[PDB]
């Protein structure tokens, strides 16, 4: 679940893209049932550039989880 903003079962660069569109103000709602559970990776209950930065670290294997 955390990171899987489109709900497809895997955390990948399409979730990262959707997070970018959300930050850019181009997407209001993630396909995930719960945008916060899916999109908030640092625990302030908001989605912002920092969650996106964290997803990038995960996808690069710099961290193993959130």
């Amino acid at each position: 679940k955390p990171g899987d903003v489109d709900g497809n079962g895997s955390i990948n660069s399409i979730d990262f893209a959707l997070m970018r569109n959300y930050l850019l103000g181009n997407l209001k709602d993630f396909p995930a049932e719960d945008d916060i559970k899916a999109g908030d990776l640092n625990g302030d209950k908001s989605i912002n550039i920092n969650d996106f930065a964290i997803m990038r670290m995960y996808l690069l294997g710099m961290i193993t989880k959130f």
Binding site: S10, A17, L59, G61, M62
Partner: protein
Amino acid sequence: TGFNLSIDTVEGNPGSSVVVPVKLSGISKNGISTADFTVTYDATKLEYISGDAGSIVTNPGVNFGINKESDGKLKVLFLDYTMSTGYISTDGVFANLNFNIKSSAAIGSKAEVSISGTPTFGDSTLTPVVAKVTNGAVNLE
């Protein structure tokens, strides 16, 4: 035209450096806006030094990254941070992987360089584009 993710088979000499290109072909007019995949390599023969964006990559200082997660395992990531007109449109080299070939490695042997697990590509609509994968190698000569 079919979409392909491929790793070249390149020749190199034990004790020398070598570049292994990773390429995309069959990119549609919808382009490529996102990518992620893992590259494995034979770390008993190759020492990873660095990885660079290939010539088809837009604004690589922003959009592209490669990280060595562990010996033999690279993670590759691309996104059009503009989410607008920065998608990759041209077939060619997507990443250049720079290794030193270990001096112990036997002439005539091969150091495999492969995609590992599931790769993901999204077009400019963020629709998944399934890639045919072809793996590669450093052919030691």
